[PDB]
């Protein structure tokens, strides 16, 4: 049921609908010669949306906006990126001309900045120290601490027991680490141990690439990480 990489199209954008008001966003890139996948999260907040990152590119973020327009039909308000990189933040610039408020934590805009992506326009105060939650409408932003990269940040659902962990939770396909150009192998597994210990009430899990699961994605990612760390 889950869309897969080999069902959507580089362009394209697919909507999953978790539960009442909650849905991921699947869209593809081309990266290293391959297809990856990659999801986001909508969340229904009274008559708005709230998103959670870009869909990897401004042509795919163009996408994703028709796509919610003609599934859902309720204007997209606001979106935070969870953290630095190309598939979060790359499409800002296209939601910001539509009219949506982009966010993200001042550790992300700096570290964006640095690296010639595009910069979220307001900033999450209260996300800077590791164990760090904050609310923001139907969700709750948490700061794990350092993993996949340093600014990473996980949401929660509470309304649907959605949590969404981003690029540093890997889907059960992935055996190996990948992209750790800008992790802290150090801490990832202890920032992971934050997630459960914070949300252990959580149902859904939803990793940056690829299918959800449950709560073992947190095992499993630290199983690869650790295996990584042994190289
Ligand atoms: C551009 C993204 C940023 S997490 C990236 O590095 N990716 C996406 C899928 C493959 C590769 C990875 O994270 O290993
Ligand atoms: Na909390
Ligand atoms: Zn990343
Ligand atoms: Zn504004
Ligand atoms: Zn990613």
Do not use: M
């Not at 993993?147 to 939770?169: E, F, M, W």
């Amino acid at each position: 049921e889950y869309p897969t990489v080999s069902e959507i199209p580089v362009g394209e954008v697919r909507l999953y609908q978790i539960a009442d008001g909650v849905w991921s966003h699947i869209a593809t890139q081309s990266f290293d010669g391959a297809v990856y996948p990659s999801n986001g999260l909508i969340v229904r907040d009274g008559d708005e949306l709230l998103l959670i990152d870009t869909a990897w590119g401004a042509k795919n973020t163009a996408a994703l906006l028709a796509e919610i327009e003609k599934q859902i039909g309720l204007p997209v308000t606001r979106a935070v990126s969870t953290h630095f990189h190309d598939d979060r933040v790359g499409g800002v610039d296209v939601l910001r001309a539509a009219g949506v408020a982009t966010y993200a934590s001042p550790s992300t805009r700096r570290l964006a900045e640095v690296e010639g992506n595009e910069i979220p326009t307001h900033s999450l105060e209260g996300l800077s120290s590791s164990g760090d939650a904050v609310r923001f409408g139907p969700v709750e932003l948490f700061y794990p601490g350092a993993a996949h990269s340093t600014d990473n940040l996980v949401v929660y659902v509470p309304s649907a027991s959605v949590l969404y962990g981003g690029c540093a939770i890997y889907e059960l396909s992935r055996t190996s680490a990948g992209n750790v150009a800008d992790a802290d192998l150090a801490e990832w597994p202890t920032s992971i141990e934050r997630i459960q210990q914070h949300y252990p009430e959580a149902q859904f899990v939803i990793p940056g690439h690829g299918l959800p699961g449950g709560l073992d994605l947190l095992k499993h990612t630290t199983n690869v990480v650790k295996a990584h760390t042994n190289r």
